[PDB]
Amino acid sequence: EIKILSLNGGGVRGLFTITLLAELESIIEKREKCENVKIGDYFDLITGTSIGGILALGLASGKSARELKEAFEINATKIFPLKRFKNKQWWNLLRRSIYESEPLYDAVKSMIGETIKFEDLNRRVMITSVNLSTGKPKFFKTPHNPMFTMDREIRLIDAAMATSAAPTYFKPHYIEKLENYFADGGLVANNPSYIGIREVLIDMKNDFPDAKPENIKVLNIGTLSEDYCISPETLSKNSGKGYLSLWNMGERIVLSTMTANQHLQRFMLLREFEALKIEKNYVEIDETIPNEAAAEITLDNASEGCLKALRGSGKKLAAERYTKNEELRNFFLKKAEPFVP
Amino acid sequence: SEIKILSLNGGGVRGLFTITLLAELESIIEKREKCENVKIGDYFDLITGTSIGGILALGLASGKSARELKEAFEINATKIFPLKRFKNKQWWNLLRRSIYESEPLYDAVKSMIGETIKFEDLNRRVMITSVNLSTGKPKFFKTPHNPMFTMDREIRLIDAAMATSAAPTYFKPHYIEKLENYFADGGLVANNPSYIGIREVLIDMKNDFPDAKPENIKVLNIGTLSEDYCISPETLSKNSGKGYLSLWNMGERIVLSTMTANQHLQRFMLLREFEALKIEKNYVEIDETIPNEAAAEITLDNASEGCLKALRGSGKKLAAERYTKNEELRNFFLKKAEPFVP
Amino acid sequence: SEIKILSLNGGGVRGLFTITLLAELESIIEKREKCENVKIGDYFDLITGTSIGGILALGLASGKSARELKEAFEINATKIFPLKRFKNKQWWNLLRRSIYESEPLYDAVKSMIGETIKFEDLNRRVMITSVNLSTGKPKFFKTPHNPMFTMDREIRLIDAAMATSAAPTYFKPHYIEKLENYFADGGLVANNPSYIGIREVLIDMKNDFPDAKPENIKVLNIGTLSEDYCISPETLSKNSGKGYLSLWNMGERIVLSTMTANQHLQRFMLLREFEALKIEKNYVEIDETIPNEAAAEITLDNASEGCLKALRGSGKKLAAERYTKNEELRNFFLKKAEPFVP
Amino acid sequence: SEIKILSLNGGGVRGLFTITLLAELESIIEKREKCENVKIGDYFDLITGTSIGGILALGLASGKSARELKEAFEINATKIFPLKRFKNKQWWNLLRRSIYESEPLYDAVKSMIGETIKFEDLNRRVMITSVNLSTGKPKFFKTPHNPMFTMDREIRLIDAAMATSAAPTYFKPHYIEKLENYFADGGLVANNPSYIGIREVLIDMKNDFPDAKPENIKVLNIGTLSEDYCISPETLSKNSGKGYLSLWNMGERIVLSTMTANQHLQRFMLLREFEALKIEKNYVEIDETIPNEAAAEITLDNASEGCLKALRGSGKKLAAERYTKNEELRNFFLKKAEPFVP
């Protein structure tokens, strides 16, 4: 059996992902009576996208979900300042990109470091990004495929910065080693679960020479951005200032895209699993916050109320799902094996 | 048996290359096989498509010939993308409206296909790739060839064609009155519908092919001369601090980058799966990389006579060369396909 | 036995792409194969080139390393093609002058190879293509390596490098004082000197390699991202009846189309010959086409920071994948090449 | 196996020498072998050509005798290159427009062969060389003598003749409606089609010649007395100020140098191959430069009476002398080559 952990991209909503992971760590430590546990040791491949990809890199580097959550908590208000979330306007966003790359760069530096590279990792990890300099999607992965060993000298922080560089919400990330600019991985796969299974079946065939979909279990942790849509009130204007709010300043296009690719990847994965008559393998933990609408889902809302709501949702979902669900426990039954390049 | 799929990528004007290649294939089929009144859409069980590729797929499924579609699309592509609106892009106008309007495209679809023909009237299976901006999910307009999914029966073909051809920035989101929803371009999720077409054949068309396998599936992916796209390196070097205006060009670069990246991803997965199955000969794709001075010219915006001439010449040359060389292209049309019964 | 030929095309800063690819190859051998002080030019019995490719060929044959040439060429190419001379091209400036002065290229070549080195002191065979304007016949600069033809024995390497890179309009014709003859770019006759390299090995190498046959010959044609080049469709459609200004946009368009034609023709003959001899694996070409954008900017003489960055990245990526997946590339560097005795 | 090829090398107005020589050879055949209604086309299995050489090759492949072509040449040569346009090359006119209109040359070709005969109607194999400006690749019009390449069946001979003789700076590019592409002179990529003709016979014309080797192939490459073109040294020296306009005379010198160097390279490679195979007697290049013309004054569009009479006299004298002494022409002109079937 092969366990895959895939994290979607949600921006501030990645607080839900990290809180769920930390609460699962705590629940395992108490109920199973373990000592000094790490939640990244229960997955054979930890994919991710955007801040989900950042968390995946953090888990692969050996950092536990609790210190990761603490770093997220301290850096959440600095990555996504209130002064930037408010006062967007068309004129400001037509001349620059909202939010700066320095704050989340410092956050990632405190998260994983600055000199760590893909070669030193002991866990398999596959991030997703769009290479703006060529147009082909770029998948930063550890040298688990002997043919795919062109990222050993690339630092983890560079990949994390590249995959989290949303088209409008940030700026494209320049990688010095490759001399190429990269964009957010949500433009190709906001749900890296399906491409994760594809990579497991086709790429890491040396480690597992008889890997089949029946032996692949995926724990996809979302950011509650699945049920995103453009609100009908702003959709049915298409006139003057109404059109300016239709596509906003790029954010509407990017968010609608990322939601659409997430939906398509999850949907085709579900159809494939049903065709294989194996639906227990795909385990997903998602919900919808009350009092928030489909279009109220914002990728950069760092208000205290939203942070508290994400914290509570993560805690309650982790507790309830571990209490009632059996597949999550079977996920967190046996620790995985080191990649050992 | 042998299940054949027609994949038509989305390229707006660049679908002229695909339609010209299909018309030329029909003509050489008639010339060499000594047939008559041939239709390129009668040899395909499923006809996938996206954007202008989706419109062409709907036209072929509706029984129209490739040559009539080619002529109508020539006139309508001249009409849809005016030079007045193409040259007058700027940014003040683009902040208050889309670059083009849907009315010329609606007239184009009506002339090429019709207005009253619905998915139930079709005798050929056809896909339409689109994104629903009201529910946030991708909607795949299909013929009622699966009893479980039949919601498209009371939807006109023109509605689906306008839904799939409504690019985010180029066109306004098309409104469907029956579903009370707004739809956007299908290239946002799948600009190369070959992979989703294969998946649909495997899972959603087992009623007519109970023992359908990926091994005996034939895919003909007619590209739109847009296999590779990139962002200008000088723009990335100098303006990678300025959003929208510069580094995105009113979101045109956003849309194009998303389309190119997801098409590349889907093509890569399709190729890897076929190679793993050792059936790489089952996939036939026609596409060329446009050279230096013409690549920066032929885009999804221009109806200039030069671009149309280049697209038509490339289509004719590619059709002739591939028909003469590739045997698989011959076996694609060696036999017809039985129309599906709802 | 086995004979290896290195052939480089000419594209300007695409020469920087080529030298980046060669330097990354050298680094890959240094790391994976565990070799110290490795020069990429030690594994070829003949190293041909044209224009900037010819300059790199002469540098490698003189005994320099690929990394040294890359480090020199980055700064010297930022110097060779100033943004100033690029910006004001107009039509009167090009009617009274060439685009660039040859002095920056002169100092560049002096930095790479030198000024006192001659063809007689070389240890590895090198072939350089050029056109003799004074006599009309093409001139093929080469270290003798043949008792019957040692004309270029007393000719400096730097003079040949300046002559082969002297584009008809981008530069002025180089004047060799020793021969009292002017010379032009070798790309007018051979942008891709692979077929000519085959002929030279099969003819000139009859003493060093008596049993010379095409089946025991391997070619590594490192392209310079200039495989395809076609004139813009708008100019052909509209101003096909106009003069030098619009159509045939000076030596730029004329020479670019000419070099593209010869490159395609020579590669066509080489591929057809290798198919006839069923040794198609003996030709290894490392090249790729540029997408819609990065096409109007990655040009013959565009030494901008973004363009250089893109070329460097493309070279690194192509080097990595082509060394990883191609067995022929690794087989090229398994054994060194014996230096030739004059 | 005595395969014979008739290759003609460009020349523009200077094709009068080649046509006069061929007509005189016909006359001497009739006057010496006592034969009647002798055509020179059927003594050659393949008739290659380029520019006006390609026009004459198409005329001979159509079945016309060399005398009718010679008379049509004597009229249409002075009808094609007006003295008004020749004396008015100038510089602003050539910057705005081209030197010569294509209507006189179109009328010349129509009066020579016609306007409706296509490549399929021919009974003799023929290769016509041109460069495709729309795709930047060399296009080789040929009769359907190879089943693999048969895309030229529905192409009129007049269109191919116009395309192959469309010099870059002299005539406007020819736009063929059937292929929807613009074409340029074939002399840019191959001004001496002897080598490509031998390659075609070796590896393309194999359906009717399964047992073919270079030792049993004979080529009669009739030049056009322009093999010694060179740039005048004073123009090379004056390339700084107002004299730099003379160098690269609005691209005319560029194209002339490219054609001269290309023909020299092709002849040089063919001679190398034949001497390596010791079959140099199979190559009969029938040309000899006039002794009343500077090597640097070898133009391409001199329609004056003196040049025409010099070409006529040179052709007659060369034909007479070479049939008197050279036994290779006599061995060439013994039997009629069997016509081929499509």
In angstroms, rounded to a whole number, what is the distance separating the alpha carbons of residues B202 and B213? 7
The count of residues in chain C is 342
C-alpha to C-alpha distance for C262 and C190, rounded to whole angstroms: 6
Contact partners, residue C137, CB within 8 Å, separation at least 6: D261, D264, D268
Q: Do chains A and D touch (3 or more CB pairs under 8 A)?
A: no
Q: Which residue from C316, C321, C325 is facing A179, i.e. has the nearest CB?
A: C316
Give the whole-angstrom CA distance, residue A253 versus residue B180.
21
What's the alpha-carbon Rg for chain C, to the nearest Å?
19
**Distance, in angstroms, between D123 CA and closest chain B CA?**
21
Distances A31 to A319, A330, B169, B197, C146 between C-alpha atoms, Å: 12, 14, 53, 47, 84
β-partners of residue D118 are: D156
Q: Which residues contact B164 (CB under 8 A, 6 or more apart)?
A: B10, B49, B50, B51, B54, B55, B128, B129, B130, B141, B183, B185, B186
Cβ <8 Å between C276 and D190: no
DSSP letter for A239, please: S
- B294 contacts C296? CB cut-off 8 A: no
Residue C341: inside a domain: no
Q: Is D148's CB within 8 Å of B325's CB? A: yes
Residue A197, token pair as written in the block? 């299974």
DSSP letter, residue D172 = P
Whether A57 is covered by a domain: the verdict is yes
Nearest to C24 by CA among C324, C327, C315, C329: C315
**Residue in B313, B320, B325 nearest the CB of D180:** B313
Query: Buried (b) or exposed (e) across B185-205, using 16+ Cβ within 10 A?
Result: bbbbbbbbbbbbbbbbbbebb
Query: Which residues of chain B are within 8 Å of residue A274 when distances are taken between CB atoms?
Result: 203
Q: What is the CATH number of the domain that holds D136?
A: 3.40.1090.10
Q: What gap in Å lies between CA B212 and CA B208, rounded to an integer?
A: 9
> How far, in Å, CA of D156 to CA of D175, rounded?
13
B-chain CB neighbours of D179 within 8 Å are 313, 316-317
Chains that touch B (3 or more CB pairs under 8 A): A, C, D
> Encoding tokens for residue B173?
């989101």
Closest residue of chain C to A134, computed from CA coordinates: C291
Strand order of the β-sheet with D217-222 is: D3-8, D217-222, D283-286
Task: Count residue pairs from B and D with Cβ separation < 8 A.
Answer: 26
* Radius of gyration for chain D, computed over Cα atoms and rounded to the nearest angstrom: 19
Residues in A closer than 8 angstroms to B263, CB to CB, are none
Determine, yes or no, domain membership for B341: no
**Pick from A181, A38, A161: which is nearest to A111 by CA?**
A161
Chain B residues whose beta carbon lies within 8 Å of the beta carbon of residue A247: 168-169, 251
Nearest Cα of chain A lies from the Cα of C228 at a distance, in angstroms, of 18
Match 């594809």 to its residue by tokens: A198
Kindly list the residues from chain A whose CB atom is less than 8 angstroms away from the CB atom of residue B244.
Answer: 93-94, 168, 249-250
Largest CA distance in chain B: 61
Partner residue opposite D265 with nearest CB, options C134, C169, C189: C189
Does residue D226 have an active-site annotation? no
Which of C268, C290, C292 is the mutation pick for testing B, counting most B CBs within 10 A?
Answer: C292
A184 is catalytic: yes
Question: Does the residue B57 lie in any domain?
Answer: yes
Size of interface A-B (CB pairs under 8 A): 159
β pairing state of A180-183 and A173-175: antiparallel
Question: Side chain identity at B101, as an amino acid letter?
Answer: E
| Cβ proximity of A130 and A137 under 8 Å | yes
Backbone phi and psi for residue C327, each to the nearest 5 degrees, phi listed first: -70, -30
Partner residue opposite C134 with nearest CB, options D196, D233, D239: D233
Sheet strands (E) in chain D: 3-8, 49-50, 127-132, 137-142, 174-176, 181-184, 217-222, 283-286
The beta-carbon neighbor of C306 closest among B234, B260, B309 is B234
Shortest alpha-carbon distance between residue D342 and chain B (Å): 14
Gap between the Cα atoms of C303 and C78, Å rounded = 6
Q: How buried is D116 (Cβ within 10 angstroms: 0-12 exposed, 13-18 middle, 19+ buried)? A: exposed
Return the closest-CA partner of residue D267 out of D210, D221, D335, D310.
D221
**Whether C257 and D133 lie within 8 Å, measured CB to CB:** yes
Q: A218: alpha, beta or left, given left = phi > 0 and alpha = psi -120 to 50?
A: beta
- Rounded Cα distance between A131 and A150, Å, is 14
Q: How many CB atoms lie within 10 A of CB D84?
A: 7
Chain C neighbors of D98, CB-CB under 8 A: 241-243
> B340 lies in a domain?
no
Query: Between chains, do C325 and A147 touch, taking CB under 8 Å as contact?
Result: yes
Distance CA D22, CA D65 (A): 9
| SS3 label, residue A127 | strand
Chain D residues touching residue B310 (CB < 8 angstroms): 134, 180
- Residue C332: helix, strand or coil by DSSP? helix
CB contact under 8 A, B307 and C228: no
Q: Considering only CB atoms, which chain C residues are within 8 Å of D254?
A: 168-169, 251, 254-255, 258
CA distances from C263 to C157, D61, D136, D258 (A): 24, 30, 10, 14
Alpha helices by DSSP H, D81-155: 83-86, 92-96, 103-112
Whether D148 and B291 lie within 8 Å, measured CB to CB: no
| Closest CA–CA distance from residue C132 to any residue of chain A (Å) | 40
The count of structural domains within chain B is 1
Q: Which helix (H) or strand (E) holds A131?
A: strand A129-131
Resolution stated for this PDB structure, in Å: 3.1
Burial of D318 (0-12, 13-18, 19+ CB in 10 A): buried
Comparing C-alpha atoms, which of A2, A25, A130, A107 is closest to residue A58? A107
Q: What angle do CA B26, B6, B33 make, to 5 degrees?
A: 25
- Nearest Cα of chain C lies from the Cα of A150 at a distance, in angstroms, of 7
**DSSP reduced 3-state for A277:** coil
Write the DSSP string, A164-223: T--TTTS-PEEETTTTEEEE-GGGT-SSTHHHHHHHHHHTTTTT-TT--GGGEEEEEE--
Strand-pairing partners, residue C138, are: C131
Q: Using CB atoms, which chains have 3+ pairs under 8 A with A? A: B, C
For chain A, list residues whose CB is within 8 angstroms of any CB belonging to chain C: 133-135, 147, 149-150, 178-180
Question: Looking at the DSSP assignment, which residues form a beta bridge with residue C27?
Answer: none
Query: Structure tokens of B20?
Result: 């010209």
Of the residues D45, D152, D159, D185, which is catalytic? D185
Q: CB neighbours of B155 closer than 8 A, spacing ≥ 6?
A: B118, B119, B141, B176, B178, B179
Residue B200: partners with Cβ closer than 8 Å, 6 or more residues away = B46, B48, B127, B140, B142
What DSSP state is assigned to residue D121? Answer: G
> What is the amino acid identity at position A41?
D
Classify D22 as helix, strand or coil.
helix
Query: How many other CB atoms are found less than 10 A from the CB of residue A307?
Result: 19
Cα-based torsion angle of the residue sequence D198, D199, D200, D203 in order, rounded to the nearest 10 degrees: 130
Residues of B with a Cβ under 8 Å from any D Cβ are: 291, 309-310, 312-314, 316-317, 320-321, 324-325
Task: Collect all residues of chain C within an 8 Å Cβ-Cβ radius of residue A178.
Answer: 313, 316-317
Tell me, yes or no, whether D90 lies in a domain.
yes
Q: Which of D250, D223, D243 is nearest to D51 (CA)?
A: D223
Closest among D269, D196, D261 to D5, alpha carbons compared = D196
Chain B environment of C298 (Cβ under 8 Å): 233, 292
Q: Which residues of C touch B307 (CB under 8 A)?
A: 233-234
| Cα(A327)–Cα(A284) distance, integer angstroms | 10
Domain residues for the domain of C162 are 3-332
For every residue of chain B, which 3-state class applies, written as one string? CCEEEEEECCCHHHHHHHHHHHHHHHHHHHHHHCCCCCCHHHHCCEEEEECHHHHHHHHHHCCCCHHHHHHHHHHHHHHHCCHHHHHCCCCCCCCCCCCCCHHHHHHHHHHHCCCCCECCCCCCEEEEEEEECCCCCEEEEECCCCCCCCCCCCCEHHHHHHHHCCCCCCCCCEEECCCCEEEEEHHHCCCCCHHHHHHHHHHCCCCCCCCCCHHHEEEEEECCCCCCCCCCHHHHHHCCCCCCCCCCCCCHHHHHHHHHHHHHHHHHHHHHHHHHHCCHHHEEEECCCCCHHHHCCCCCCCCCHHHHHHHHHHHHHHHHHHHHHCHHHHHHHCCCCCCCCC
Chain-chain contact of A134 with C320 (C-beta, under 8 angstroms): no
Query: Three-state SS for D222?
Result: strand
User: Chain B residue closest to A136 (CA)?
Assistant: B261
Looking at chain C, list the stretches that DSSP marks H as alpha helix, in order from N- to C-terminal side: 14-32, 52-61, 66-80, 83-87, 92-96, 103-112, 157-164, 195-204, 233-238, 250-276, 305-325, 327-332
Q: Which amino acid is at C225?
A: L
Q: Please name which of B270, B285, B276, B172 lies closest in space to residue B223, comparing C-alpha atoms.
A: B285
Search chain B and give the residue with CA nearest D153.
Answer: B320
Q: How far is C290 from chain A (nearest CA, A)?
A: 9
Q: List CB contacts of A331: < 8 A, sequence separation 6 or more.
A: A3, A42, A217, A219, A283
| Amino acid (one-letter) located at D287 | D
**Among the partner residues D133, D247, D264, nearest to C138 by beta-carbon distance:** D264
Residue D230 corresponds to which tokens in the numbers above? Answer: 């060179």
| CA-wise closest residue to A245 among A82, A98, A93, A84 | A93
Task: State the Cα–Cα distance between residues D39 and D19, nearest whole angstrom.
Answer: 13
Q: Give backbone dihedrals phi and psi of D47, rounded to 5 degrees, phi first.
A: -120, 95
For chain B, the distance separating the N- and C-terminal CA atoms, rounded to the nearest angstrom, is: 21
Query: C259 to chain D nearest CA, in Å?
Result: 9
DSSP string, D36-86: SS--SGGG-SB--EETHHHHHHHHHHTT--HHHHHHHHHHHHHHHS-HHHH
Give, as one character, the DSSP assignment of residue C339. P
- What is the rounded distance in angstroms from the CA atom of residue A291 to the CA atom of residue A299? 17
Q: Of C91, C181, C252, C254, which to mutate for an interface test with D (greatest number of D Cβ within 10 Å)?
A: C254
Cβ–Cβ of C293/B234 closer than 8 Å?
Answer: no
Domain assignment of residue B98, yes or no: yes
